[model samples]
Target: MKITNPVLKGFNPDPSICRAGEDYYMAVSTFEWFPGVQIYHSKDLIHWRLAARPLQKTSQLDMKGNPDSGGVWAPCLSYADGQFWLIYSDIKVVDGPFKDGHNYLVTADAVDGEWSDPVRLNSSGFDPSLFHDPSGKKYVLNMLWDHREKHHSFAGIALQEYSVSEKKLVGERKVIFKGTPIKLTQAPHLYYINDVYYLLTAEGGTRYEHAATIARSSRIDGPYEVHPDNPILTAFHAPSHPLQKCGHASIVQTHTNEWYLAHLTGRPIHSSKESIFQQRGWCPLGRETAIQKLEWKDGWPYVVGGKEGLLEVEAPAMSVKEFSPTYHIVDEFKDSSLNRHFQTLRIPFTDQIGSVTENPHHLRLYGQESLTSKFTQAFVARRWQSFYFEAETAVSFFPKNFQQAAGLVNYYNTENWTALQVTYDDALGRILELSVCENLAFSQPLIKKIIIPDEIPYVYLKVTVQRETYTYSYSFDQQEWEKIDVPLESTHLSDDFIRGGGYFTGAFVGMQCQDTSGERLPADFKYFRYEET
Candidate 1:
């Protein structure tokens, strides 16, 4: 059978690639899964496996919401200089983007294990990328939030030589690229081929208009030139696939000179290309990776057939042909450790959560407060990982009081959310009643209190976040559904909520089974499935 290229669908964005011996590893922007950042592995640049997520050790880095606009931003996987590295942008934090003491770096001997503590990169802005050229000289590509050509919101591509030991850049950074393509660009990474350095970037805006562009420079710092083809990916330009926003990409090559591009992609209900913030997975767009074949032509690296080109007679290979499990968000949750798909909202405490606790039957989650507060909550959520997706699971709710209730939700911030709460309302004749929660602040306001059909003590909950328009739908069972009347206002819930300046990135759609009822109740999530709709 001819396989589809984007085997993994639904908001899987910001792909970082690394080649180790015979295996290829990939990682992406894990917006808010504390025990922060997820790691994936691929064997032929096509089929992949979820190896590990490094946010497990709370001491590894601070997942405590950076008030100004914190959460794990773009995390890239690098297997350079004989060590595995996970470089991330954990900025301003949930409450403090500017005061979080600058962006930092995390290194590890293995992609799977308790990764090391963050080594301060001593730079500012989001989407930080670390580069090591052949000469053994390290380079820091800081996406200057102010790197601009004619824009104000996103960063322009800039380069700085760094002193690794001192954890600082040695000299004045030069603006190598500007925010030019279709209005926005940032998250710059550099690679060398044939003596020329290529600076690939995210552009066309991350919203519905997102895209990945490539530019090359002969020198580490220079006047970079956009590939004559400009943006290498975008559904608005693709002729074969459904509407997709492809940006925040990382490229890698094999010893045999095979090139592949991995970036964020989402499957939308409506045309996903119409607008931004109306998507999920920040739903990982697939949490599954998208594969595009690349080759150098006329001194420039380009997608096989250009942005609008197709594979024609060729197709993408899957692990099923050679490897099993083939990588789906399916979990038994029986491992002694956490899976790559599972992550927390902030840096986690040692005793807060247990993946396979008490004889490995039920997953034990000790709730902190994301159920009510966005900041400082012990929330471990899976990557939205997809658009046109449905994540459903059975949760054992044991809420002792109203304030300390537990339920499932699709949350970005306090302002943009729709959650179902199972509060202990003694007044009601039912033991459990589900209540819909939302904030009526976004442009497309759709929040209201709704009643669940039956009081389900142990309920099977499912949330469906359609693309283009962020309004979500839910169901207690596989059949019968109710769309929440309130549409979450994403703009208001943005960084603007702080000094009122909105920080734009991908939207995160997560499901939390929280307990905030004050009296701790034992709860368990049977399993989580991120399936294509």
Candidate 2:
């Protein structure tokens, strides 16, 4: 079987994997999104499924004021004592003293079952991991963040023994590996291979200059020897590489006795097809997860299929040849609960967002914050998986004031988004509105409005996205659709356009409701349809 790049796509970054029995489980970072740390299960290593997300309940995790891209950072998954342990850091502040940033761990016996309440870990640094040695002893590994003004923020990797019975870390923290010459060295994981403890860490930054380097020591804690080749995997110098920012990887071994590296990578698009080969345009889809085959040379692991990375590689040599189904284009709210495809920013405001029997098959949503709010918002969305696609949602909303509205949205972050909504205009009554919010404000912008009759109880909102352009349309009866906003340039809603503020996630197409006037207006959503063209 042949495998493709980006085994997991769109807004899924910081790949970490651990195998149990013949089954493999992987988890990725989901910043500022509830039900955090998306866990995937695989048998053949090529096909994957949404297994579980440990941090679901408000009791277990609360990211109410977590800044955009400031919730769950890189999560490390490991298996021990017949249970799976997930370690992650909840980043509250991106700068200054980096205060309130704490590390936590959770465990579950079953992959898809209820997870144990989070066990509070130390607040030393982000990207924490648990290395359960073969001797049944466990050690905690993480990046030691330095707060001193003149010190390097990426101080070094820290290690300490952990007591599972006591549920606390023991012994003094030791600085293991200092890091490569590259700056911003972080995301550390320790692996013992053939009696050699190998230390893998990401270097450089998370952007175009990202990388993965390695070192080895005979003992778990020791003077490690950096790989002579240093950055064992990087695309920084390979401008022509389609997959850029390839780093923050975890090493895993399959049942076939083969080794592979699951790493974070980005596939950025070019504005002009004439300059398609140039490293230009934006990564609107955000950092994705890719798997690279690894080969051993002189006791050192090297990325196979060349140093630039492979878009296509040989599948894991396993008997299970079946692949999981692709992302379904339609989501019908007939089920009792929301599907795994749906996600909400920060903590989920589930009290007013879900399928309600009042409208039979409709997903009911009570208005909350506008898309610009950094606080908890009543918005449910799915990653925009394809560039050329159409998303339509049938909504039945009756707004009484300008503050009350609900409809479809193309969202990047709190600062940037576009929406086609049914709002209430004092002079025009219920109205159809197109709003483009840049820098988190509705100022002199690409805004449009038209009165919609109260008799029209429901409307169909549609948006078609082709590359950097977006075309928005609406229909009264789901047939006679009329264009409202055409060719709305949306290139700026991406990782490239976003500077500072720790923006890691990508563009999303979904539904949003707002009732900022304390009315808490309710809206009904019939269905959501996403068709890849």
Candidate 3:
């Protein structure tokens, strides 16, 4: 069997994996997106599925007005006592003092079933994980954050005892490894193997210089010694490496005794004029999850083959199986529940979004604020993967006022997005409009507007992204597509060009609506489909 790099792609970062029997389970971060912490299940570690999103309820998660990449940071997945354990940090604030946050843990007998409510854990800092010692003693480990401006933000890793019966952490906190020479040391996971305690930490920042460093100790609470080699794995120094930002990783051992590390990495879509030191390269698809084989040399763990990760690697010595990558799919709206591919920002407005009509072919979305609002917006989108892709939907929308409109959108946050809609015009009446929203300046978002004489109720709206350009088209009868305006250059849609910085998630395409007048304007989508070209 052979597995490719980035087994999981597009906004799937901070991967924490654990193995149970021959089956494997992995979980990744979902910042500011509802149904947070997407868990994937796999048999061969090649083919994966969106098994279950455990943090579905508002009681376990909340990100009302979180900035970009400011909701859920990192989640650690481990199995013990015949149950799956997940611990994560809910980061409401991104910068400065880190007092306003909480670390919670949830457990489930089965991965896909309803998860237990959060059990409050000590939030000395973020990126908390659980380490189940073989002696029936459980301990939680994390990077302790120093809020003091004078000291290093990532002070070191912390350890504390946790009791399964009490459902809360216990005993005094012990500070472990203070980190290596590199900066931004976080995301710690502890493992006891070969009679040595290996503490893995992600150092350097999560940007181009990200790396994975390790240390070891004879006791759970250390006096830990750093690996003399330090930074056992990283692509930061290798400027031309295909995989960059390879850090914030977790390790897992298979039933066959093969060891592997699941790490976060990003592929640069293009380069920038800024120097490499400033990390000017653009990762339009965001931080994704990748795997690398690990081998022990002189009782120290190191990435196999090289310091830089590879695109393809040898799988465990097991029977071979061909697995189809099914990241993209079509939703025909034939069922009452929403598909797994669809996701909403913050809490979903269930009453205002989705369809309740007698006709099951159409999925309706009632309008609220424009896409810029952080509270709630009528928007449902899927992650944009390949550069060349097409997403289209047949929509039936009739706008009564200028505030009401319904159509497709290529979104990358509030300041950076493009929308095409069938909207009402005070002067032109019912018309089709295309707008590129760079900021809150909706007063002048209209780039192209065409008046419709026949008032076509049902029209096909499509967005074709080729390379770095986005082309919007529409058809009255789904026969011929009339492209709107010249091709829109989408270079600004990348995370590098995000206004006010802090770009984590990648681009998304979906149906959007705006009823600023509180009209509760509705738009009916017949079927939404996407394909990678």
Candidate 4:
């Protein structure tokens, strides 16, 4: 009974696990954040839960203008024939060399039901998986991107075949396993165990040299074999190891056959200023989902407790099941949906930009784009899952000028963030600023505004974050609080200082609004607490 390493935490990254009879589903990676893919549910892989995001409608994900760690990537989750497959990647363009990324497939007879709608599979590159074979044969694996400049843009792992009566992706694709030199070979995950076929991929690229390499073949189109001791899992030779960028993995067995794995980690944090780009410290909290415990040896598999990453693992004799710890939440908008612990931006949360029955209890939001806008904004965050937390919100917003605004942010994308809004100042009319944005460079560290008193009505706001300092306070009366003496720099929100490239995602803390003066200014909000200090 131990189980603790991440097990799915903030910005849950590429993990993929499956097992159906004793039930264990896992999935992860929701890049541009929408309902994309983030299922979890475990009977006892040491208790997990959240079970179902299933790309919730826009006809199974749209991500308007995507980009910024581009929408959903690396989601695999499997269980055969009785249904619950899911494989994904939406990535509409990340940077230079073209990567419209596509790849899809969905299903669900119930892992928390109603999936099925996306079935396009194959734009050719991005962690996609779906193996299922004991001769019932179905394959799909991915990672083959090559934008040629003389090749090597991670051109490896690919495999095709999938004709569950022609739902597409059939025959002739194979690039099998060009990896092991630990290059960027992305997440693949095939397995068959015993007639051999193993595979698994994810190499040195998810940052800090991530890994989890393995290979083996005996034919499933692999020509494989590497992993004599290749990265069976890694925190890249443990650079201090509290799990920092361990690779994108997936494995499951337990119905007492044991074997675990679930990878993709990151915990960083170390910055106290002193640049060189601050070395390798900040991770904000992105790339998570740990769990490792595997053994096999002589037939290869390792990482029982050595290739780094382990905050505590080793649980699976079954029956201990506990749960109840979703990093604190409060929410109180009285439910009309909109608190599966919030998430918005890059689509979905529409009623133009927010709702919850328009204003039955609150959470209205309307103001659109501006928090750097990587498309649409009127945000709605979550995932800062602790490094000392305390979020709080309340809003009511009435700005008619300063392009409107609403409060409480912290985000870390579209070029980093840090808000506290409640705008409208033709000379401090209903003030309260605090901005910041590092890397896309914006700034407004107080010095003035903080006026708010046009009959107050509702303001609350708070921020807290004491791990690399963060502070921003306000209140009309939630019982005395002032703070705002400028502390900011929670490692610059961090994926190690995201400058122009979309640093995979993490650090989010709720609520936002903006309006840009197009007159769609609403705001509402009332109640959002986060707490974990």
Candidate 5:
């Protein structure tokens, strides 16, 4: 069977895969987003679907004021002893020399069922993984951090014993592998095969030079030897490859004993002089998950195609399964809960922000804070999976003052975003305007705002993205759209162009409501439709 790259698209990064019998499951990072981690399921390794988001409750995960690119990072999923074990870290601070976060462990009897409360673990560094040995012994593996100026920040990979009975990690922690010359070693996953422990680590800082390096040792903790050909997988040298920044990898074996590698990759779009930020390229879709078949030769695993990432790879011999396409989705807001694709920032959507049951068939979003607020804000969005796509939404909002606003938005973070909203003006009773925030600089594009009639009940907003360029439009009757003349740069909403701090997250488009007047003004959304062109 043929497998296409990026089985999981749009902001799904740091893939950790595990297999139970014939069923395969994968977990990815969701930094600053409410549902801590994204779990995907696959039967043939070619077709994957969103299975579950284990960290749903505030008790399981709480990230109220996590900065951009902070929160959950590099979740590890493994099935052991008739249950699924999940390990992750809640990164509170992303910038500066010192990294602050806490590692946690959660378990569930079934993958999609109710999950147990998180058990606090060590927070020496990020990217924690739980390894279950054949002898019923469990071990916790993570990267150790040294923030002192005299030492390297990404110190090395650490290993410690975990007691299943005690429900905590025991014994002395040891630094097993210091990594190769490709520093910034992280994302540790320990695998035992053929009586040898294989340790996989992601290095090179998760940029264009990111790579996956493997090491081996006879004992679980001890003198580990780097692979003969270090950086067994990397795209640093292959600049033209479609998949760049390939690293944070995990391997799984099929029922037929075929090995496959799953890793995170990015697809960047070239930028011209007129492009925002004027960088070489940017990845608005963010780091995605890809797979590659592995071949074992002389007791070492190797990517079958090449060290550089490939767009397509051959899969294990299994019947190809067909699933419904999700390129186009429309939500009417009739369900009791929001669609699974929508996610809020830092926290889940509570009653204070909004609720679906309040208005029956509309997603009523009570205005909270501005778009730049990192704390509480009534904003819900979905990822930009493709470069060429269209998003439309109908919002019914009545603003009595200039402080209240609600509309559609194309967002990257608190510092970078663009929106078309309906607000109030002293002269015009109600008006529609375009606003933009590039690297925290705020500006309104149009000098004259479009006036809305008093009889209009709802305003339709739409954004059409064509690779690097995108345009916004508005409709009073939903049939005729008045396109905004200003063409915005879509690449600005990407990790590469983001200024300062970490840019690990990708671009998102959805609805937003803001009421700076302190009165919770409600904005009801009739429906939201997204289609990839």
Candidate 6:
């Protein structure tokens, strides 16, 4: 029962677990920020629960448009026969001669259903394995990239027999196996145990030597035999364990057969900066779901402890049920139900989020045409995770429409933002407070303004981020805390410098409040709080 290592948390990777009796379901690789993937459910494989969401949104996916990791790949969760085959890879780079730009199929007998609209499968190729050769017949393992005969070796692992009930692409494509320039093999799973059929591969270069190997085929379909004790599982093979570069992995067997391994592991925090935050966690990467404890030895399977894997004097997973929210709260506008940590990165308009000018105490965001402008649509702006936080909002101006104004900001995308707006200067009648920077362009420490009380229509905004400047405050009776002068540095507004260049990913930090683009330009936030000093 002792199984540990990110078994499943956050960025789950290359895992293709299958078990229906004791129940275990997994799915990973969302690459394009889609509704395209994120299904997890476990019974004792160490706690998990995001139930379902397979490309259910983000335009249902076709992100072949490519950006930020580029539309999903490396998915091979299976359940066979009765019905459940996930089989994926839908990438882009002009459908590339192949790196991630082909391979797709989405089935469902109910792993959560509705997944069955992406069935492309171009042959340029990517990781796409799914077997059934105990003589039942049904293969589709791939790698392809042979630029005419081994200069680059152009990937070369193959096997083809597709026709799962005539979904098409049948027969003729077999190459069987080839990769060793540096073992850049990449996600190729196959396991048969007891009769010899273990061609499971994955090696160095899935990012810093993500090892894992095995190859043996007494018959399934091969002349295979490459396991002179290869990979076996590694994080530099356990270079003193802080969970270094563990490999890309996935293995499952247990209704009692007892054998569990889910690779990918990472740990480098405290002061941060492994080349500026590449410390991806939900622990583990490449193929890291990491859970060692294997030793079938001759039948082929090896991963047995040492590097932070089966070691527990007992103390390493923290966050003991501490519910934090200094993200101050004060929403008394009857609560329309929008505040469960807030979200909106995919067009949602109703004037953004309306109303809060009834008798006092507000909440309104009417901004437009700018988050790099594609006609703009906001929401996904929320920040308050340690390093200090604070936010206060209260706005008003019903002078028949004095062009209303509200303020506050700090974003990590949109060329990097920093705001504090409250400008409704009717040719200079008052209310001209500001601080906007659309890309380090600057909007004065934060545009200034003051006089506006016609019977306390309301006016009090606050912002105070800490860890390198972001301090703006206001008050009327929400308790004394005046110190608005504008700071704005916050570590140069980071993802630690967007050091993720190979294909994009890594860089996130948020905070927001809006209004002033017109047409019912609303703003109601009577209490948007944050804390942690």
Output the number of the TM-score-best candidate: 5
* Winning model by lDDT: 5
Order candidates by TM-score, high to low. Answer: 5, 2, 3, 1, 4, 6
In model 3, which regions exceed 4 Å deviation? 272-280, 321-328, 356-359, 439-448, 489-491
Model 1 over residues 407-436: C-alpha lDDT tens digits?
A: 566654444555554455555422333343
- Model 4's TM-score against the true structure: 0.38
Return the TM-score for each candidate structure.
Answer: 0.77, 0.96, 0.95, 0.38, 0.98, 0.31
Model 6 Cα lDDT, one tens digit per residue, 1-533: 34445655324456666677667777766554434555676766665555665555433455522533555756777787787777777565423233446787777877777767666655556677778777787788867755443345346577777776788658687767675545667677777888877787676754434567667887766878876667666655444455544655667786766776666554422234433233332211123354666667657666665323553122223222222432235544455544433333333324444433442544455544344332244333443333455666665533223444445555544454555545456655535365555444555554446654456555666776654456676655557756666565654454333223222222223223334345545444555554445
Worst window of 10 by summed lDDT in candidate 3: 439-448
**How well is each residue in 419-510 modelled by candidate 2, as lDDT tens digits?**
88888888878887888876666652435566676678789999988877888998888769987744676566788787565868888999
What's the lDDT for all of these models?
0.59, 0.83, 0.82, 0.82, 0.90, 0.55
Q: How does candidate 3 score on lDDT? A: 0.82
Clashes of each: 57, 0, 0, 0, 0, 33
**What lDDT score is found at residue 255 in candidate 3?**
86
Candidate 4 lDDT, tens digit per residue, 389-464? 7888888888979888888898878777888888988966989888888877888967867798999989898888
Q: lDDT value for candidate 2?
A: 0.83
Question: Residue 409: error of model 5 in Å?
Answer: 0.6
Sequence-dependent TM-score of model 2? 0.96
